[PDB]
Design a protein around this ligand. Sequence first.
Ligand SMILES: C[C@H]1CN(C2COC2)CCN1c1cc(NC(=O)Cn2cc(-c3cc(Cl)c(O)c(C(N)=O)c3)c3c(=O)n(C)c(C(F)(F)F)nc32)c(Cl)cn1
Ligand SMILES: C[C@H]1CN(C2COC2)CCN1c1cc(NC(=O)Cn2cc(-c3cc(Cl)c(O)c(C(N)=O)c3)c3c(=O)n(C)c(C(F)(F)F)nc32)c(Cl)cn1
Ligand SMILES: [Cl-]
Ligand SMILES: [Cl-]
Lengths: 122, 124
Amino acid sequence: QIQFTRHASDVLLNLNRLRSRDILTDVVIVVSREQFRAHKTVLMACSGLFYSIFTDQLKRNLSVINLDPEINPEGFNILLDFMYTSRLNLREGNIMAVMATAMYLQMEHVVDTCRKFIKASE
Amino acid sequence: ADSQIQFTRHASDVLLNLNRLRSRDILTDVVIVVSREQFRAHKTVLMACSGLFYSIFTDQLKRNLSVINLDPEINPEGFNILLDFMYTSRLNLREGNIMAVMATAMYLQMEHVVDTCRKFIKAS
Ligand SMILES: C[C@H]1CN(C2COC2)CCN1c1cc(NC(=O)Cn2cc(-c3cc(Cl)c(O)c(C(N)=O)c3)c3c(=O)n(C)c(C(F)(F)F)nc32)c(Cl)cn1
Ligand SMILES: C[C@H]1CN(C2COC2)CCN1c1cc(NC(=O)Cn2cc(-c3cc(Cl)c(O)c(C(N)=O)c3)c3c(=O)n(C)c(C(F)(F)F)nc32)c(Cl)cn1
Ligand SMILES: [Cl-]
Ligand SMILES: [Cl-]
């Protein structure tokens, strides 16, 4: 069929615009003292943890999810921006936190990219 | 010591997973009614892909509606082609459907689809 090569990226951009305007967000993720509003569909599409949560009968209808308090909010922020943008901002000062947060969120390609960053920088 | 990494497959992988959720009726939040067919979807995806749906659901008086009735003169098969396009990036244009898809894309305010329809006509 006719393939629109920019369509998926344009969809994601528009989803990120909805998130910035707080339109149809349906969950708050709490990470220590920081709160992040998001769309469950995007979280589920991007994360094994969120897919498991929002397919679990006991948890799927929650509108507030408290993540492990040991997770670094900056690590989560970097990963949530990645979910909505395809762009992953890695630095020596954040790599360990992003990698551990990606393991927790079950984002395997992000973890592999973090390993590649360690290989390139250690 | 620093790197800004673009994941070139990420957006298409997100969209595939959204289509998987729709196919299982997970987190769908609206039924679009088009003449003799009902279609379930995610409002966020509809808004992301169509000027009409963007305008409808940005309106706070319509944002939380669970059923939207479209103009009854819209061809439901044209709509289904466009809904599948929204969730897949693939558009099935054929001589037997081009006029219906084009007219539906005008109504949904999907300009790059409309333009692709015009290119199809030009090449027919
Ligand atoms: C279950 C699956 C297959 N099933 C088939 C098999 O028989 C039928 C059809 C239904 N499918 C399905 C899956 C959905 N969501 C997920 O898969 C959640 N998800 C997302 C990712 C993910 C996505 C993108 Cl886009 C990325 O860029 C990256 C990255 N850069 O790291 C990571 C991911 C992951 O890395 N991992 C290990 C995992 C983990 F679970 F393995 F841990 N889960 C991840 C959604 Cl929403 C809807 N349907
Ligand atoms: C308004 C915009 C920019 N604004 C910036 C500018 O300063 C601040 C920020 C907020 N923004 C925003 C917009 C959102 N949604 C839409 O734009 C709706 N949408 C989507 C499309 C569209 C999208 C994809 Cl992916 C396609 O593949 C195709 C296609 N192949 O045809 C068509 C589309 C369109 O073609 N047309 C004419 C129109 C129309 F309205 F013009 F008619 N609307 C379309 C969403 Cl959800 C969230 N935020
Ligand atoms: Cl914006
Ligand atoms: Cl599948």
